[PDB]
């Protein structure tokens, strides 16, 4: 396959991007991978920019709405698809490679061999969606094998996902650096998300409560965990039509260890039918 | 700094990071890295894998020795020196699983069939450790015996399904003079059992030649030979396609058998061509 430097090259065939990546790597360039499901926003662009600043980088952005990480009807069909906007954004950002595989190219044998995540996948986001993270980790493993990047970039917004990807990389001895990039926010604090488009004006106004609650908690935390959680709860309680699914303060690895001084506070809430996530670093007893 | 590597000698590494760094360095110097995964206690079957790896031009051979809990140290290393193997990778359980069992590989449904009957989690263990070894060593080719044919097929599923950039090489089964497939378990057989054990290979070779008369003739011939043996408890005798799906009307297939002799479980298999 041809590679035209300094412009966007789009490859659909896994073999094509694998060949181009291999060839680039062999000439000294360092391959950076930003895996996405399209519907690109400023959060994704932050990832692209982080990747682009690595000296000698060539940036590969994958766009693939992975059916394996969705449960039956109708989340997969409802996922936003804005391909023309996505590719326009990548061109504007100076990205040289977009990898846009088909479902058939990624899953020619259906679901056969898959990744089984550790117990974290059953908690928080995985509670009512027990197969979700197996879908995520299976596709990320495949993308890593196809592209063979030196570094792979993920937002901190989906923090549990990022932790599970670090687990994947450690547990399977993958030779890639996982880079977590801090959450990009709207001016009022709202975390970037492709689901923000489903907030009507009232819901958009109310949605500020998630980030306001988290940031209140982070500052309250000088007074301890209870104070932090209660400050967040108070802000969420004050918000019209925010229905909290969970609000949890955990150790930074979200694993089988108690909170000791460095934590992550995670929230998920519904505004109408729209489920929003956010999270923040918490230091306990630290001003 | 890359760990020391002495060309033409057996270099032994226990740390995953060490063998990873050495393998990477060697492939940059124009070597082709060949991986032979084993659980030690090496026999002539393993040596055939080693010789197959060695004959690839540019080869450097990595033999891993790891008893994988999820599925003779000095003597093994001496055998490898004698074969001209340059790398042995001998990690501890703690080095392979520093965080315990966490993320694992879930095989497809083939893993529940045949050998997966008595050992329903066996292949998950095998695929998980093989994936890790492939990521640590990053070989150009990886070598497995055909004797554990279902294992080999599941490894080919792993490689295809996860888009791994490695060639899987199956090596024809090494056999004792009477046909018994090589295995560390053969020495456990008493004389009566050892004599009866020849029935597995004899049944398969009979079937392979009976196959000109069709699938049923092949299966019936194999069953007759097993039926002539005392103390051979057949767990299965199945004719499948080469990927272990259902056998087609004509074409290539594989005939697999497993049996228990006393407390010792033996496996064997053979290529079958129908008609
Ligand atoms: C870097 O900040 C962000 C924020 C939200 C995001 N959603 C998906 C990636 C991502 C990144
Ligand atoms: C290539 O022949 C063989 C025969 C039996 C085997 N057992 C484990 C590896 C192996 C290889």
DSSP string, A24-35: HHHTTPEEEEEE
- B186 and B113 in a common domain: no
Reading phi first (left if > 0) and then psi (alpha if -120 to 50, else beta), residue A259 is in beta
Task: Give the domain CATH number at B122.
Answer: 3.40.50.620
Question: Alpha carbon B164 to chain centroid distance?
Answer: 18
Report the residue of chain B nearest A139, measured CA to CA: B162
Q: What is the C-alpha separation between B129 and B61, in angstroms, rounded?
A: 19
Residue B171 CA to ligand 2 center (angstroms) comes to 8
Looking at chain B, which residue has its C-alpha nearest residue A164?
A: B103
- DSSP β-bridge partners for residue A115: B105
Ligand nearest to the CA of B145: 2
Binding residue per annotation — A142?
Answer: no
Are residues B253 and B180 both part of a single domain? yes
Q: How many residues are present in chain B?
A: 275
- On whether both B164 and B212 belong to a single domain, the answer is no
Contact present, B87 and B63 (Cβ < 8 Å): yes
CATH value at residue B243: 3.30.1300.10
Query: Cβ separation of A174 and B107 shorter than 8 Å?
Result: no
Full residue range of the structural domain in which residue A241 is found: 183-287
Which residue has the least CA distance to atom 3 on ligand 2? B45
Q: Distances from the Cα of A10 to the Cαs of A21, A53, B273, in angstroms?
A: 13, 21, 44
Reading phi first (left if > 0) and then psi (alpha if -120 to 50, else beta), residue B55 is in alpha
Residue B134 in contact with residue B164, Cβ under 8 Å?
yes
Query: Is A39 close to ligand 1, i.e. is its CB under 6 Å away?
Result: no
Q: Which of B102, B124, B162 is closest, CB to CB, to A171?
A: B102
Residue B274 phi/psi, 5-degree rounding, is -80, 105
Q: Say whether A18 and B108 touch across the interface (CB within 8 A).
A: no
Q: Of B6, B46, B122, B209, which is the active-site residue? A: B46
Measure the CA–CA gap between B185 and A24, rounded to whole angstroms: 49
Encoding tokens for residue B171?
């090596």
Provide the sign of the torsion angle of the four alpha carbons B23, B24, B27, B29, taken in this order: negative
**Structure-block tokens of residue B18:** 């060490």
Claim to verify: residue B143 and residue B226 sit in the same structural domain: no
- Give long-range contacts, CB 8 A cutoff, 24+ apart: B221-230: B222/B255, B222/B257, B225/B199, B226/B199, B226/B200, B226/B257, B226/B259, B228/B199, B229/B196, B229/B199, B230/B192, B230/B196
Ligand with the closest atom to the CA of B44: 2
User: CB A173 to CB B132 under 8 A?
Assistant: yes
**Cα separation, A108 vs A129, whole angstroms:** 24
Cα distance between residue A101 and residue A81, in whole Å: 14
What one-character-per-residue DSSP string does B40-55 give?
SS--HHHHHHHHHHHT
Three-state SS at B223: helix
Dihedral angle sign, alpha carbons of residues A152, A156, A161, A166: positive
> A193 is written with which tokens?
């998300």
A106 Cα to the center of ligand 1, angstroms: 24
Give the residues across from A60 on adjacent strands.
Answer: A33, A97
Q: Which of A126, A159, A182 is the last residue of a domain?
A: A182
Indicate whether B152 and B179 sit together in one domain.
Answer: no
Active site residue B122: no
Q: Which of A4, A44, A132, A219 is catalytic?
A: A44
How far apart (Å, rounded) are the C-alpha atoms in residues A26 and A241?
54
Q: Which residues of A touch B136 (CB under 8 A)?
A: 173
A142–B136: do the CB atoms touch at under 8 Å? Answer: no
Closest chain A residue by Cα to residue B20: A175
Measured in angstroms, the resolution is: 1.6
Same-domain pairing of B106 and B20: yes
Other Cβ atoms less than 10 A from the Cβ of A51: the count is: 26
- Asked whether the beta carbons of residue B99 and residue A170 sit closer than 8 angstroms, the reply is yes
B272 and B178 housed in the same domain: yes
Q: In this structure, are residues A280 and A215 in contact, taking their beta carbons and an 8 Å threshold? A: yes
Strands (E), chain B: 11-13, 32-38, 59-65, 87-89, 104-106, 141-145, 167-171, 233-241, 251-261, 264-274
Q: Which of A182, A206, A238 is the last residue of a domain?
A: A182
Q: Is A265 helix (H, G, I), strand (E, B) or coil?
A: strand
Ligand closest to the CA atom of residue B52 = 2
The contact set of A with B (CB < 8 A) is 14, 18, 109, 111-119, 134, 137, 141-142, 145-146, 148, 167-168, 170-175
Tell me which of A182, A204, A229 is where a domain ends: A182
Q: How far is A203 from chain B (nearest CA, A)?
A: 38
The number of domains in chain B is 2
A-chain residues within 8 Å CB-CB of B163? 14, 18, 142, 145-146
Structure tokens at B258: 């497993």
Residues B112 and B206 in one domain: no
Q: What is the 3-state secondary structure (H, E, C) of B148-171?
A: CHHHHHHHHHHHHHCCCCCEEEEE
Same domain, B143 and B264: no
Residues of B in contact with A18 (CB under 8 A): 163, 165
Residue of A nearest to B101 (CA): A118
Give residue for tokens 């412009």.
A7
SS3 B77: helix
Verify whether the Cβ–Cβ distance A113 to B165 is below 8 Å: no
The structure tokens listed for A103 are 């479902």
- The answer on A162 and A174 residing in a single domain is yes
- The strand pairing partners of B141, in sequence order, are B34, B167
**Tokens in use for B236?**
């299965």
Same domain, B136 and B1: yes
CA distance A172 to chain B (A): 5
| B chain contacts of residue A116, beta-carbon cutoff 8 Å | 103-106, 124
Angle between helices A14-26 and A132-147 (to 10 degrees): 50
Closest to A285 in 3D by CA, of A225, A213, A215:
A225
Same domain, B167 and B196: no
Top residue of A18, A25, A144, A172 to mutate, by most chain B CBs within 10 Å, is A172
């Amino acid at each position: 396959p041809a590679f035209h430097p300094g412009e966007l090259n789009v490859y659909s065939a896994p073999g094509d991007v694998a060949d181009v990546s291999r060839a680039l790597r062999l000439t000294g360039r360092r391959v950076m991978l930003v895996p996405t499901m399209g519907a690109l926003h400023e959060g994704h662009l932050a990832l692209v920019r982080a990747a682009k600043r690595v000296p000698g980088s060539v940036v590969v952005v994958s766009i693939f709405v992975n059916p394996m990480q969705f449960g039956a009807g109708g989340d997969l069909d409802a996922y936003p698809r804005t391909p023309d906007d996505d590719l326009a954004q990548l061109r504007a950002e100076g990205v040289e490679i977009a990898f846009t595989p088909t479902t058939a190219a990624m899953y020619p044998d259906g679901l056969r061999t898959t990744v089984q995540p550790g117990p974290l996948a059953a908690e928080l986001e995985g509670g009512p969606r027990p197969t979700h993270f197996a879908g995520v980790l299976t596709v990320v493993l495949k993308l890593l094998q196809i592209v063979r990047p030196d570094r792979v970039f993920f937002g901190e917004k989906d923090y549990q996902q990022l932790v599970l990807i670090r687990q994947l990389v450690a547990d399977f001895n993958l030779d890639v650096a996982v880079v977590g990039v801090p959450t990009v926010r709207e001016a009022d604090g709202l975390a970037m998300s492709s689901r923000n488009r489903y907030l009507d004006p009232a819901q958009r106004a109310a949605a500020v409560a998630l980030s306001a609650a988290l940031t209140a908690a982070a500052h309250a935390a000088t007074a301890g965990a209870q104070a932090a959680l209660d400050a967040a709860r108070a802000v969420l309680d004050a918000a019209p039509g925010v229905a909290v699914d969970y609000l949890e303060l955990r150790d930074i690895g979200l694993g089988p260890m108690p909170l000791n001084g460095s934590g992550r506070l995670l929230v998920a809430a519904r505004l109408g039918t729209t489920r929003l996530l956010d999270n923040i670093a918490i230091e306990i007893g630290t001003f």
